[PDB]
UniProtKB/Swiss-Prot annotation, chain A:
Coiled coil: none annotated. This is E1A-binding protein p400. Residues 35-291 are annotated as: Interactions with RUVBL1 and RUVBL2. The gene is EP400. The chain holds residues 876 to 1313 of 3159 of the full protein. Ubiquitously expressed.
Curated annotation (Swiss-Prot), chain B:
Gene3D superfamilies: 3.30.420.40, Actin, Chain A, domain 2, Actin, Chain A, domain 4. The keyword Magnesium does not apply. Belongs to the actin family. Component of numerous complexes with chromatin remodeling and histone acetyltransferase activity. Component of the NuA4 histone acetyltransferase complex which contains the catalytic subunit KAT5/TIP60 and the subunits EP400, TRRAP/PAF400, BRD8/SMAP, EPC1, DMAP1/DNMAP1, RUVBL1/TIP49, RUVBL2, ING3, actin, ACTL6A/BAF53A, MORF4L1/MRG15, MORF4L2/MRGX, MRGBP, YEATS4/GAS41, VPS72/YL1 and MEAF6. The NuA4 complex interacts with MYC and the adenovirus E1A protein. This is Actin-like protein 6A. The lineage of its organism: Eukaryota, Metazoa, Chordata, Craniata, Vertebrata. It comes from Homo sapiens. It is found in: Nucleus. The modification Phosphoserine is found at residue 30.
Length: 291, 324
């Protein structure tokens, strides 16, 4: 009889499964309702090429990463660890199909207990692109506290209100429509690990959104290079300041705007700066090396 | 006709319906000094006081279930069924061990139970819903002992710590325990105030008083580790991963915690020893009543009681036959 009401409690368990299934159904229903400092340091540190799988990974899969790593994934993790260690924003340019997400999740779980490094990291992503990336984040790191940013303006505002709090959760996220609705709401905290991807094809990149993408507050920032950064002034000298903040020139103090001819010469000096800042962080190579 | 489930525990009586979560009446119990009915008339009277004053319902209507001590003697059970059916004329009856209900309250049939009441703290390993009488270990280092330490440690403080004053005298030493007693070595302490306002800086007394049950006689850890020794050989791993605690007397700060350490360092480290943390007073105080309330409610309870019928066809003998 004990086994019998344990059976009835097991039908309670299947009722719980019904509750979870209805919660996923309601997920669908609501979704329907819905100068060269960092440069030189990265040149020295970031292992690349033959040093993409064979290096000194002095920080492997952390305690909080309940998942494995590819050798070059471990190396990206180690480079990110040093990158924060040296107060650096850095680009993680592991080619797509090689698992940038594994490196980023491992770095989220590693930039952690020790310093207790807890700013709700970040990932700047698309509304549609947030889903799979967050799925991976919780897959490899089901322990790291995370917060999502997609939903009704009520839910989005509630999430935004709790972003300013430091140590609140490991990882923060942001889409790009709510970026229209959250333009200056993402420059709040000096996030301990900021990450930018998909910024390239953001709709309506107005000067508003230009800047808001540019000078997000961070104690660290990351970037994913699906394709090497581009020969457009704004985006990439941002990516540079991003890479080299705290410089003698505050970002909004941009030295001459527009690519005029004289501004083209000043921009060629800035392009020397540009290449030197961007190259060190491009761990970009084909599957052939590290398939 | 909602089934009534009463706990007649040594120091308080927990009473209520099967379908309700809480015993609607929890009042002080005495005719249960050793653990079983010492005074049948006083026992019968307090039961009478229960049906009429505590629940305001005749016993003749609702089905009734009573819980009894694991180590109790049979003669108590035969007489209880004799007294209960004859006097109250209930339609259906049942008897279950308090330890069994706790394991039922904790939703874990196979387990080991630690509880304490008036004068007694015991260890009872239950397998497959069956109490192993041979495995039971009964110790005197109950809550009363610790409170008696409190009372003496209050008398040495020379505070002014008819029967009601004794009830007050006993009530306070228990109330002090919950607030203060935790298991110079204690650093600055609480400022607990008596109703009249008297108090003191209750220092190491909060740490030394609880230590008696571990070291005043068999400590609680010794009570249990031996109990499993006395039981079967191969089920012992099951008990260790299923140890439970119940009883208001077990409500001391870091009590369950210190128990985990004492056992973790006494059991083989390889063992999967685990404690189920029903440490809340409400959990502990209700644990026995909860199991009984669950038991009566179920749809197979409809065949498990000793109906009034069984008692006409057979006398006291049914108790040993229907209740494990």
């Amino acid at each position: 009889e004990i086994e019998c009401f344990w059976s009835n409690i097991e039908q309670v368990v299947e009722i719980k499964l019904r509750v979870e299934l209805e919660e996923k159904r309601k997920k669908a229903l609501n979704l329907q309702k819905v100068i060269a400092d960092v440069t030189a340091v990265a040149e020295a540190i970031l292992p690349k090429g033959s040093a993409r799988v064979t290096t000194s990974v002095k920080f492997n899969a952390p305690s909080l990463l309940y998942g494995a790593l590819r050798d070059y994934q471990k190396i990206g993790l180690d480079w990110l660890a040093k990158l924060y260690r040296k107060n650096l924003n850095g680009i993680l340019a592991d080619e797509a199909g090689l698992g940038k997400t594994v490196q980023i999740i491992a770095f989220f779980a590693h930039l952690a207990c020790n310093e207790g490094n807890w700013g709700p990291h970040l990932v700047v992503v698309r509304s549609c692109n947030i889903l799979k990336w967050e799925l991976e984040l919780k897959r490899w790191c089901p322990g790291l506290k995370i917060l999502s940013y997609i939903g009704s303006h009520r839910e989005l505002k509630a999430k935004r209100q709790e972003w300013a709090e430091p140590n609140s959760f490991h990882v923060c996220i942001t889409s790009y429509t709510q970026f229209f609705r959250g333009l200056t709401a993402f420059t709040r905290v000096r996030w301990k690990c900021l990450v930018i991807d998909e910024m390239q094809r953001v709709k309506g990149m107005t000067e508003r959104h230009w800047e808001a993408v540019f000078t997000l507050q961070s104690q660290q920032r990351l970037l994913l290079i699906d394709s090497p950064l581009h020969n457009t002034f704004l985006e990439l000298w941002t990516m540079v300041h991003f890479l080299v903040p705290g410089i003698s020139r505050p970002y909004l103090s941009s030295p001459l705007r527009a690519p005029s001819e004289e501004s083209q010469d000043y921009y060629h000096k800035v392009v020397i700066r540009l290449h030197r800042v961007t190259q060190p962080f491009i761990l970009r190579r084909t599957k052939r090396d590290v398939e | 006709v909602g089934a009534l489930v009463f706990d007649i525990g040594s120091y308080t009586v927990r009473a209520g319906y099967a379908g309700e979560d809480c015993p609607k009446v929890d009042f002080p119990t005495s005719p249960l000094k050793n653990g079983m009915v010492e005074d049948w008339d006083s026992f019968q009277a307090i039961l009478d006081h229960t049906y009429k004053m505590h629940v305001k319902s005749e016993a003749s209507l609702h089905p009734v279930l009573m819980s009894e001590a694991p180590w109790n003697t049979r003669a108590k059970r035969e007489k209880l069924t004799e007294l209960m059916f004859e006097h109250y004329n209930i339609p259906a009856f049942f008897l279950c061990k308090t330890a069994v209900l706790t394991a039922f309250a904790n939703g874990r049939s196979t387990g080991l139970i630690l509880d304490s009441g008036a004068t007694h703290t015991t260890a009872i390993p239950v397998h497959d819903g069956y109490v192993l009488q041979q495995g039971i270990v009964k110790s005197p280092l109950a809550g009363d002992f610790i409170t008696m330490q409190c009372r003496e440690l209050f008398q040495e403080m020379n505070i002014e710590l008819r029967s009601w004053h004794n009830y007050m005298c006993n009530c306070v030493i228990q109330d002090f325990q919950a607030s203060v007693l935790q298991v110079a070595a204690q650093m600055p302490t609480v400022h607990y105030e008596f109703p009249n306002g008297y108090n003191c800086d209750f220092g190491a007394e909060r740490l030394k008083i609880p230590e008696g049950l571990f070291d005043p006689m068999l400590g609680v850890s010794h009570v249990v580790t031996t109990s499993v020794g006395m039981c079967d050989i191969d089920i012992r791993p099951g008990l260790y991963g299923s140890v439970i605690v119940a009883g208001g007397n077990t409500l001391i700060q870091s009590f369950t915690d210190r128990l985990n350490r004492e056992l973790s360092q006494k059991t083989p480290p390889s063992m999967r020893l685990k404690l189920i943390a029903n440490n809340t007073t409400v959990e502990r105080r209700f644990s026995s009543w909860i199991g009984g309330s669950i038991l009566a409610s179920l749809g197979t309870f409809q065949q498990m009681w000793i109906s009034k019928q069984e008692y006409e066809e057979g006398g006291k003998q049914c108790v040993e036959r229907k209740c494990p």
